[PDB]
Amino acid sequence: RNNYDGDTVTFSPTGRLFQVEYALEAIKQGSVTVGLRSNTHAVLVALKRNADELSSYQKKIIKCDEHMGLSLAGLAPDARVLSNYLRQQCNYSSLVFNRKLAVERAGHLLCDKAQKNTQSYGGRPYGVGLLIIGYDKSGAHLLEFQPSGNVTELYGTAIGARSQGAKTYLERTLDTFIKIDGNPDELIKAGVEAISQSLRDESLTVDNLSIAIVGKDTPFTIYDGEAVAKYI
């Protein structure tokens, strides 16, 4: 019996934490979502699962501010907490300083929240990993998030159930789509052959797909619905 895993106060008998290490299998029983970078324009894509042959689909992408957004993967209601949190900081460092909030500063304090739940008796870890993008006065970025706190600045990654069937596309084609700039019409095409390698016969209906994009001269914005049959 792997004891010592009743709560996030106790260590392993080695130096490991199990409740955290059990959270990371939550993202693995959600859907997939992916994110790229260029030196001018970045992007993310996500397949959103139904509830039956009749329901709607799941609001998966959410505007935290105009120069920055995210794309969740895993347990959603615990993501709404974080999404509201960014929406306050960004609405705090513009009523006071007026400065565009640096995207890297966001992940530089979410980690200072997923920790302070890891310590004390009560609550849980934020059982979801998620991706962040954003343009700023420095350049485009991508920042991920996994529940344990560790965020990382990347060119492009993906997460969720059956995602490593996409990462190899990236590690295979990384040197190409990073110099690219000025023409998002094909970068956005990149993830689609990146994600379509990682499917259980899903076949990518127009309704079954969400895209969000940012850029220097472009705000954050969602492309779903009939405006996405283009990017099949």
Binding site: Y4, V9, T14, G15, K116
Partner: protein, 246 residues
């Protein structure tokens, strides 16, 4: 491993007299990367055994060093967030000091604060010890200093220091330098010997590709502030070891 029933929580002494839960935390950093810091005649230096996941990592945009205001530096191994929730209190704790006592912060009294903020987090039952082994040092009116930090709370004033996977390698690879250089060093003759050590350390992990970062604060080459490195200095300091080994 010996005692069983007395591991489920802090604030329990084994009958030998020993709280095992802390005895398990420090068995974590041993499953963490490597970092060091050695004292110079003028100032101090820092290093790190950075690791990777792929080429996907942005080169030189995922720093593991973190800084304090008044020309003071910090680095931490192990579970990096707990080592960051601790220094996040540092920049919070000095502005409780220099706001009041009109002056920048001394290092030893600063170490006492972090050296017992940890103690509270092994003095209760509803908390967890910080699973790190922090390093920090800098400059003050009375010269340069260095320390090492550890979840038991028993910090010390060292000459050089190490942790992580690469303790025993740097247990001796640093001990030599105190023998060959009683006269002290400069930062220029130091960083040409620190990045040496990191490459000696990675030998245990020849597969896991890596990266390297350095920090150094001295009153000679920086006039008493904490600065990173750049340019053709680390571009050759690496080569002070990339060629020294092979």
């Amino acid at each position: 491993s010996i005692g069983t029933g007395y591991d489920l929580s802090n604030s329990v002494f084994s009958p030998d007299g020993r709280n095992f839960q802390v005895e398990y935390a420090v068995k974590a950093v041993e499953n963490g990367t490597t970092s060091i810091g050695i004292k110079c005649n003028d100032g101090v230096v820092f290093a790190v055994e950075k690791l990777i996941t792929s080429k996907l990592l942005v080169p030189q945009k995922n720093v593991k060093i973190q800084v304090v205001d008044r020309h003071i530096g910090c680095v931490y191994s192990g579970l990096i967030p707990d080592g960051r929730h601790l220094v996040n209190r540092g920049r919070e704790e000095a502005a409780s000091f220099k706001k009041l006592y009109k002056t920048p912060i001394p290092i030893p009294a600063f170490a006492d604060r972090l050296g017992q903020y940890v103690q509270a987090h092994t003095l209760y039952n509803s908390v967890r010890p910080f699973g790190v082994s922090t390093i920090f040092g800098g400059v003050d009116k009375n010269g340069a200093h260095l320390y090492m930090l550890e979840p038991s709370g028993s910090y010390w004033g060292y000459k050089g220091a190490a942790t992580g996977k690469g303790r025993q390698s740097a247990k001796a690879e640093l001990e030599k330098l105190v023998d060959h250089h009683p006269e002290g060093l400069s930062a220029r003759e130091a960083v040409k010997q620190a990045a040496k050590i990191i490459y000696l350390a990675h030998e245990d992990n020849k597969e896991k590709d890596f990266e390297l970062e350095i920090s150094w604060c001295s009153l000679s080459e920086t006039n008493g502030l904490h600065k990173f490195v750049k340019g053709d200095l680390l571009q050759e300091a690496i080569d002070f070891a990339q060629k020294e080994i092979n």
